[PDB]
Amino acid sequence: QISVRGLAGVENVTELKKNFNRHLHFTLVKDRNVATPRDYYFALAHTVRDHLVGRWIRTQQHYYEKDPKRIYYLSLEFYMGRTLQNTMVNLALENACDEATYQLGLDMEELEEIEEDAGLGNGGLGRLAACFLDSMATLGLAAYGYGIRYEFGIFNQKICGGWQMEEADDWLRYGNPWEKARPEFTLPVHFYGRVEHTSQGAKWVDTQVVLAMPYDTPVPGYRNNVVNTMRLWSAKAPNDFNLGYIQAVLDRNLAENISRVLYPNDNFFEGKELRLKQEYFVVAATLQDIIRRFKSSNFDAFPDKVAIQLNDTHPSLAIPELMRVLVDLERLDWDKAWEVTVKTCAYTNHTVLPEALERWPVHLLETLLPRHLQIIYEINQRFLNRVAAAFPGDVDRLRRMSLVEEGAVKRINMAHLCIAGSHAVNGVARIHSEILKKTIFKDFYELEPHKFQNKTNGITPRRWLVLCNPGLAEIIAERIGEEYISDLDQLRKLLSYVDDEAFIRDVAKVKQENKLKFAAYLEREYKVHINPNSLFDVQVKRIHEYKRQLLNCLHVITLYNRIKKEPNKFVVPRTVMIGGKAAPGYHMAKMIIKLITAIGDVVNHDPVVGDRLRVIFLENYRVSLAEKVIPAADLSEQISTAGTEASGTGNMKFMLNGALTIGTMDGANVEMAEEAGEENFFIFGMRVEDVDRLDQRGYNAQEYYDRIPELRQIIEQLSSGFFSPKQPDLFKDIVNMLMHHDRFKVFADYEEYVKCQERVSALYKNPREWTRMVIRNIATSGKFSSDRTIAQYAREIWGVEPSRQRLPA
Amino acid sequence: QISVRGLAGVENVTELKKNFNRHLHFTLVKDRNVATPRDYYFALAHTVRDHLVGRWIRTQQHYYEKDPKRIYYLSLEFYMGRTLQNTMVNLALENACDEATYQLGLDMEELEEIEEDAGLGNGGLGRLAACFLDSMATLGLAAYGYGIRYEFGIFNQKICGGWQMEEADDWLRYGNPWEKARPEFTLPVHFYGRVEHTSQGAKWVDTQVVLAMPYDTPVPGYRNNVVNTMRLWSAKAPNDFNLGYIQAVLDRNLAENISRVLYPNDNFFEGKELRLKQEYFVVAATLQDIIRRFKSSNFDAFPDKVAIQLNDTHPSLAIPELMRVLVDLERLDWDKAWEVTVKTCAYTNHTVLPEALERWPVHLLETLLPRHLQIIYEINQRFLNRVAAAFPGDVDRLRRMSLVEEGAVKRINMAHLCIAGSHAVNGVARIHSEILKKTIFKDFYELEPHKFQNKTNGITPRRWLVLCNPGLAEIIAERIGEEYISDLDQLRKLLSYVDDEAFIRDVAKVKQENKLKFAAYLEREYKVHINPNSLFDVQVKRIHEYKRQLLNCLHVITLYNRIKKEPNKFVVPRTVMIGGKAAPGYHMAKMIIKLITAIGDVVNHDPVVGDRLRVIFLENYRVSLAEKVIPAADLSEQISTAGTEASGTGNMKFMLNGALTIGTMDGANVEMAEEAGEENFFIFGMRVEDVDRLDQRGYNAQEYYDRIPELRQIIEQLSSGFFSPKQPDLFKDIVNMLMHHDRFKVFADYEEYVKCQERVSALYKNPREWTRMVIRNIATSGKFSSDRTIAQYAREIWGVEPSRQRLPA
Numbered sequence A, B: 001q002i003s004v005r006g007l008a009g010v011e012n013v014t015e016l017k018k019n020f021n022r023h024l025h026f027t028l029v030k031d032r033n034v035a036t037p038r039d040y041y042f043a044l045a046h047t048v049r050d051h052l053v054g055r056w057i058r059t060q061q062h063y064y065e066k067d068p069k070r071i072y073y074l075s076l077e078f079y080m081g082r083t084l085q086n087t088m089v090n091l092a093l094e095n096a097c098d099e100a101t102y103q104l105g106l107d108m109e110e111l112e113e114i115e116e117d118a119g120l121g122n123g124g125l126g127r128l129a130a131c132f133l134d135s136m137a138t139l140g141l142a143a144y145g146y147g148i149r150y151e152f153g154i155f156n157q158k159i160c161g162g163w164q165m166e167e168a169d170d171w172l173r174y175g176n177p178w179e180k181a182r183p184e185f186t187l188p189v190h191f192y193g194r195v196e197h198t199s200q201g202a203k204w205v206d207t208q209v210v211l212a213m214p215y216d217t218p219v220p221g222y223r224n225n226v227v228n229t230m231r232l233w234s235a236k237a238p239n240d241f242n243l244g245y246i247q248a249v250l251d252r253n254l255a256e257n258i259s260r261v262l263y264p265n266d267n268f269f270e271g272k273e274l275r276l277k278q279e280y281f282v283v284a285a286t287l288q289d290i291i292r293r294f295k296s297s298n299f300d301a302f303p304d305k306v307a308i309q310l311n312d313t314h315p316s317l318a319i320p321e322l323m324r325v326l327v328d329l330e331r332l333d334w335d336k337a338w339e340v341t342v343k344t345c346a347y348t349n350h351t352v353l354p355e356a357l358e359r360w361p362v363h364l365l366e367t368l369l370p371r372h373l374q375i376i377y378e379i380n381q382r383f384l385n386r387v388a389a390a391f392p393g394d395v396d397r398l399r400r401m402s403l404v405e406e407g408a409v410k411r412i413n414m415a416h417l418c419i420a421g422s423h424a425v426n427g428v429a430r431i432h433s434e435i436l437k438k439t440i441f442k443d444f445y446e447l448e449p450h451k452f453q454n455k456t457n458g459i460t461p462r463r464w465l466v467l468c469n470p471g472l473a474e475i476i477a478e479r480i481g482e483e484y485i486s487d488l489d490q491l492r493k494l495l496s497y498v499d500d501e502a503f504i505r506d507v508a509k510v511k512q513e514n515k516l517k518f519a520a521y522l523e524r525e526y527k528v529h530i531n532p533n534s535l536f537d538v539q540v541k542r543i544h545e546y547k548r549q550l551l552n553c554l555h556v557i558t559l560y561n562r563i564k565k566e567p568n569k570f571v572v573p574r575t576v577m578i579g580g581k582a583a584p585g586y587h588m589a590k591m592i593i594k595l596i597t598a599i600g601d602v603v604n605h606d607p608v609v610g611d612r613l614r615v616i617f618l619e620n621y622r623v624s625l626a627e628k629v630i631p632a633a634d635l636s637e638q639i640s641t642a643g644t645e646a647s648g649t650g651n652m653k654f655m656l657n658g659a660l661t662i663g664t665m666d667g668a669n670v671e672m673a674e675e676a677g678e679e680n681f682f683i684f685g686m687r688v689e690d691v692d693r694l695d696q697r698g699y700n701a702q703e704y705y706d707r708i709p710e711l712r713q714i715i716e717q718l719s720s721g722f723f724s725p726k727q728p729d730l731f732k733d734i735v736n737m738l739m740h741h742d743r744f745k746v747f748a749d750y751e752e753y754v755k756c757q758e759r760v761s762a763l764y765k766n767p768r769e770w771t772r773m774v775i776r777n778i779a780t781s782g783k784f785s786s787d788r789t790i791a792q793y794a795r796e797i798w799g800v801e802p803s804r805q806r807l808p809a
């Protein structure tokens, strides 16, 4: 149907049809009379996966023969979403499969909706890992993602009576056709025990053993025949475990609980033993696998052949684990082992919020990982000796920089461990990396300035344009060809079409089609009715106070109050959509969801409002939902308090897909506005500097309440029970926080936000000028490809050159 | 190589080779350079399973179109063993696969050893279910086996320091290629809750729900293109289960524990809640599936279309569950529902030992299954009213026959429930069925004599001759053709060859080859050395006092003592092999294993004994081990106290494979001796009548100790520490039991057993006459085919005719 989806040749279509029928019969044990829609999905998935096999085997054989430097990306999260369409896109099979299934009397898009998301992450950090794997494969790097195969991913969100309910994401229930179990590479992982000192060094003894069994998932590059591996570990008890009899077998569950469930905290730290076990489990298994692969090729050459990237501090135990193996098992001297470790490891930081930082109680590490605690103490002593030598007499620097935090309970600061033990430390957007050098890691930057880098985040244009928005991809390819898909900078060529009447019309038509499709998806699966001619105002991301869904709520209520005051005045119609999950133990975030639905309950049923304003909470926001809503959006809400969102990546997805952005100068928003031009961005609010000035003076919310009548009215409505008639004081916690304990200064940006929103509405009244500004955004979105990000990691951190060359088919 | 293994045509071999390579590549994601032996096994298993698919789909479609009466065999145990060779045998693919793998440079026998046993049973009862499924498929019956898919089967036995250790049988670790998950037939099962009475009947409410997910395994008939189904249920928590958050997800394990592990008791009853849950789980899920299939075709016709066979009392809850569904859900009146239930259900009893009988405490059923308890009370009331009418004034009969047992804790006698609610009750050998009518169910037989039947057990000659003993199968087929494999009575034709010199030589040669092969298996996998010219004296079966492994031990010690007394006298050399698992909580059985190994420790290292006597404990006795040892045996030990072994089936396996039997007149031994002739059997010991006479007088072990000097010496050796020098009193429990508390009268059969064993040795000195007696045993083993057994169930209980006709290929 459309060109970027590839060729549908007669031989290909015929062979796909034959192989689909073969799998239905031999694999699924069905014929056409009894086959369920799920059966059809599986037949297609097996048919497509067959095409990966040859390329997967030869890619891995190629790395064995050429022995390049290997990149190991360690993460506790890989937020992959669905795999079927992505595989078809990267193999150029989409049109062929569409034709083949059509001839079999099946709708492929219907089949695609059957696949479960692999929801093995919470939000931005997990999705970043996934975009990175795509880009590393596309850039021909010998890269492996290593993580945990959680039996349960991020919970499915249900909304009951306006409240979030959580249910188990049993994503493996029907079996996962995209994985291959690798039982021959099963490895032991040790816990507890004690340290013995012998004539020739320490020994870690009397440990409990849990087995780590790997499952491999293919990561195909974009039409280059490269297929890399994501290896995820599953926990298994040994067979003599606990070995009255019945109970011993039942207790195997205790060991296997390690890989049972993803912790659902986003930017928040809970010091639970199970989480610590998960972190060590992935690190211990991964490092053994890395060492094994390195020997099957003298640890001096280790950093020349191995790079380990730590995705936040979650896998920080790789640093003392590597030291443990090198010193205790391989018998290297300390200083050489340390040199190897530092040159091998690099660390990426993803947040500056203090409550999100991992600080593990010493008593936990003492019991669970006694040898690692000893190694950490020794690292700290040697590091602090370096600090004392560089800054003689500066005793407070010594306590600030210590890996060991003193107080009620002694804790290990894992970020300090990561900096000390890594040759490179990076933030994820220019402003974030600057904040790290100026504030939270200032002392470290002064000691070792060469370690600190920036690597601005990106997203893959395969999933986030070609896959989710084929209509846009096609009209772009019509003018500039297909090369931009793996070289996104080529989108600059579209600046030549900003006055092109045909292109303006096509861009606007593609958006309308996406909006119509999304309006249809809402009616069918949720029975909610929306005006597709309204401005689609979208804020989708995890629920957090810093992200300020509450500021958006205040704007929504402002618009409602203005309409009620002057009902017969024209306003640009809006559909305001807010979606995102709240961490199950985060009370304020759960109250915010309830507020949003409560506002919708009033606004959506007011006859005077009509079709001019609707507020919809998008339930169960996840990767597959993002693929649907993002192409449909007109306005992207990126409204975090300046200095709080390290980068953001949702922002980049909206930019690439033809939405304009309303945002603060925070995270990557700054660089997006720089690329597009400030005139083509809706910027409002305090800058980082203004926030600093306010903190020095002291933030007084009452001042804003006293000076802004429209704000006072909203607070009075919330307090009095206007939005909760049966429970008048339902939102008292929200009001109290806004008035007395607001870390994120919601009121301080209110006036500027409302005014800026008026300017958005003004521009939307002029469709032609709205679309020209859109074209200017899409055209300058190139920098935000994760291909650019990964090429920078490769050159500036890992010491490897990317390659756009094909492997033989 | 040999004829009964089928044809190896050029087209077949070529296609097998191509498909093997295809699976190695696409399914296993390997090439020949990295492939492990396990990879090769899996490639072959997938290659073979492909051949089942068409036949499986058409068999099930045939049953749908013809709508025959369906047979449902309900069992908590299916002891299947390995599936690869069995599938090849039944599809006539063995020679073709052997040739195909040979041309690929692989040894198929080596590949076969990689497969895990499906050890989903304990012993005879579980293995009977498996032979029955084979025979039902071979006889073209529309039959389904229904059970539980245990994650852990019967434990693997390790012997450490002469003691049994248990380890978890993680048989699914690498994945099971012989099953297909059927998630679309997932059904809810209810537990706990309470009963509410409304205007129109009882309602079971406030229950907890566990999901039952089915997995289907094919059961191929012998070369008739029939493939039946064994459907096994796995327990799964619903997604909102327990739905702080982390713990709720972790607690899903509680629901899923239902299908985690097989209870390892053999002929012993433990009233544990988890076991009760397993029993209801299989019954509730199975009955819903049965009803669903019946409707997709007025409950008057239910018994015309459905038969349910209860394998012991373990699935006895089918009776009140069927009533529950018919009365509470379908709204049938009681008397009609009862009529349907009785005509649908039949019950097979497998033991007379009182400690093995299921008697569930009322308080357990009250909490777990409140509605079922009420239904059971109502069944009991109506049944006892019938008894009172038939036997007026017989108040003690009333309490004897009650389903409710009075006392300390009230219990439900599940055997009484089964008799009351079944149209047919059978024992499993003629003597056993007679004992049921005369003793434990005498009252029931008097009330309803027409219900009581005999169905003597059998074994499948596919697994237990063709598969495990191809050499014997071949020399038989040379003389009489191949028809006997599905018509075992044809073996009578071999009586014509009892004086045939060529046949005598061939029978003896096949045995020698099997013995040499088994002697080689022992050296390689266990480093134990045996004389292959010795008489192979084998007792393999679960360890139990009633089976009298202890009597065998006394004989072994007798032989050792005789040798030590007259070292230079000739004796027929023996290798005495004993194997079997002990239930983990059965102390005396564990002590018996230790005794056996302790005897071996003395006998096997005595220089004076030489190669004349060896005692070996066969570790981890299971189906795949039985397939190896049984063909190698010369003497089958079947020495249970008369009246205690209901049938035995190991006995039949040895008879079919050319061993002579030493045995008591117990279980099926009686019928075996009747078929072969008493002259061709080594019968010794008390008959049932003699045991009865001894019990009336009182059994005094001391009498035997006082009158038999050889017995006194053995007891003195055991007591003094001759067999345990470092722990002199190790065996005091054994001695004390033999002297004061022996329910099974070991001493009473000692003298006769030893004398009989002397006659065995005498015959073995004359190889030609030994072999002629063997031929007379093999020739009369026909009756003991499970094809005969199943044809009798079909005609006399189920009301269906077996068919030897082929379905189209």
Ligand SMILES: OC[C@H]1O[C@@H](NC(=S)N/N=C/c2ccc(F)cc2)[C@H](O)[C@@H](O)[C@@H]1O
Residues within 6 Å of the ligand: A049, A050, A052, A053, A175, A176, A177, A178, A179, A180, A181, A218, B026, B027, B028, B029, B175
């Ligand atoms: O789908 C059911 C089972 O599938 C198994 N995969 C097997 S047998 N081959 N895969 C081959 C493969 C080929 C190409 C791919 F791109 C990925 C996998 C998995 O090991 C198992 O964990 C899973 O439950």
Ligand SMILES: OC[C@H]1O[C@@H](NC(=S)N/N=C/c2ccc(F)cc2)[C@H](O)[C@@H](O)[C@@H]1O
Residues within 6 Å of the ligand: A122, A123, A124, A125, A126, A128, A263, A264, A265, A266, A267, A268, A269, A350, A351, A356, A428, A457, A645, A646, A647, A648, A649, A667
């Ligand atoms: O760099 C990628 C993105 O990283 C995000 N961090 C996230 S999701 N941290 N989760 C931390 C976490 C902590 C404990 C957990 F149990 C789970 C997750 C940043 O907020 C965002 O600005 C940035 O764009």
Ligand SMILES: OC[C@H]1O[C@@H](NC(=S)N/N=C/c2ccc(F)cc2)[C@H](O)[C@@H](O)[C@@H]1O
Residues within 6 Å of the ligand: A026, A027, A028, A029, A175, B049, B050, B052, B053, B175, B176, B177, B178, B179, B180, B181, B218
């Ligand atoms: O082997 C890995 C997985 O295999 C799956 N089987 C699939 S995909 N097809 N089987 C088809 C089949 C064909 C012929 C047979 F005689 C049996 C099965 C099972 O459902 C799953 O529980 C198991 O873990």
Ligand SMILES: OC[C@H]1O[C@@H](NC(=S)N/N=C/c2ccc(F)cc2)[C@H](O)[C@@H](O)[C@@H]1O
Residues within 6 Å of the ligand: B122, B123, B124, B125, B126, B128, B263, B264, B265, B266, B267, B268, B269, B350, B351, B356, B428, B457, B645, B646, B647, B648, B649, B667
């Ligand atoms: O009919 C077949 C065979 O049945 C046997 N019974 C067996 S194995 N009962 N197991 C009972 C059991 C009880 C509780 C459990 F948790 C497990 C098993 C008979 O002893 C044997 O003489 C006969 O040949």
